[PDB]
């Protein structure tokens, strides 16, 4: 259960192998690369047949037991690949997994892939069973801050030269979507056998495809990055995200700012964060947001938000996206005239 990174996975496999491998993450690209590497190493060691399966509450629990019993003392080298439940592991899955740990042989290998396990699930019986029999590798998608380092390292792997301008363009056009970015680098290498890529070259063969979440949109509004806020909304609209989800996510943060701003007049702001259990990393954005915004702007934002909610619920209007764009610009400190607000 030694947490590592996919880059170190190849070195770890070369040094030696184990009965089980448990890699958790939410990045499809990293999971596929790790799965291929493990499969390649297993094939080299002499494995001839491999198995794939999925684990979830919908899957029959007795079926998992039969798969565990399928292992035999005298059998060829086999590999079994499993997938964690979409929602997450539960007590029954723990019983099935710990049963598998008892039924382990060198011939059979255990591979499970899925989302990161919550701290509550860390203390599960099955996890403790494979404390030493398995290794752990995180496969979380790098954030925008850490993205450029990953791109440069990946480019160096394919012996390609990327300028600073080219690196920024790739991150901007493929933020949160590594699979497209990985293939984008491959296509550029085919186009230019020289191996050196500049700003004019990359721009020709780069399209727009990125994945965002409502939390990113809220974060942009607090910081004040108007360009990102509009860009995120456009991507979310193209994807087909439900407007109601965006309203609720913004509601909790907006209401918190109103409460903090109103009651911070006569008390230090540090105490307010402590009693509201505000995350440490977010203290910086909250503090600057309150100073930039004013009470009048907050009231207008609440009024605009309320009208948008009413229109969606009863009027069934399709202009909800237009209202969101107006609200985003309002929170970016740039003045917005009336008539658009409060109807």
């Amino acid at each position: 259960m030694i947490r590592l990174y996919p880059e170190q996975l190849r070195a770890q496999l070369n040094e030696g192998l184990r009965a089980a491998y448990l890699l958790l993450g939410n990045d499809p690209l990293l999971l596929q690369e790790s799965q291929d590497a493990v499969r390649q190493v297993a094939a080299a060691q002499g494995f001839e047949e491999h198995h794939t399966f999925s684990i979830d509450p919908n899957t029959d629990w007795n079926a998992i037991f039969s798969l565990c019993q399928a292992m035999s003392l005298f059998a060829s080298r086999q590999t079994l690949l499993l997938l964690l439940p979409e929602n997450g592991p539960n007590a029954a899955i723990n019983e099935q997994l710990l049963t598998l740990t008892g039924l382990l042989h060198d011939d059979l290998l255990l591979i499970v892939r899925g989302n990161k396990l919550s701290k509550a699930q860390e203390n599960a019986a099955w996890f403790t069973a494979l404390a030493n029999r398995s290794v752990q590798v995180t496969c979380q998608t790098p954030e925008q801050a850490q993205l450029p380092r990953w791109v440069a390292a990946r480019a160096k792997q394919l012996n390609l030269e990327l300028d600073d301008a080219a690196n920024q363009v790739l991150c901007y056009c493929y933020e949160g979507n590594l699979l497209a970015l990985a293939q984008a680098l491959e296509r550029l290498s085919l186009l230019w056998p020289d191996g050196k890529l500049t700003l004019p070259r990359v721009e020709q063969a780069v399209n727009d495809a990125a994945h965002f979440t409502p939390f990113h949109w809220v974060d942009a509004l607090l910081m004040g990055k108007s360009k990102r806020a509009l860009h995120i909304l456009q991507q979310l609209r193209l994807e087909g995200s439900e407007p109601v989800i965006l309203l609720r996510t913004l509601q909790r943060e907006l209401l918190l700012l109103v409460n903090l701003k109103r009651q911070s007049a006569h008390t230090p702001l540090r105490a307010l964060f402590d009693k509201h259990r505000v995350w440490q990393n977010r203290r910086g954005m909250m503090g600057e947001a309150l100073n930039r915004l004013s009470q009048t702007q907050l009231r207008q934002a609440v009024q605009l938000l309320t009208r948008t909610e009413l229109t969606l619920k009863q009027d069934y209007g399709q202009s909800v996206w237009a209202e969101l764009e107006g609200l985003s610009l309002l929170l970016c400190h740039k003045p917005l005239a009336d008539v658009f607000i409060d109807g």
Partner: peptide, 9 residues
């Protein structure tokens, strides 16, 4: 109106 507020609207 939004384009006037910001060119990226």
């Amino acid at each position: 109106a939004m384009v006037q507020l910001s060119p990226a609207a």
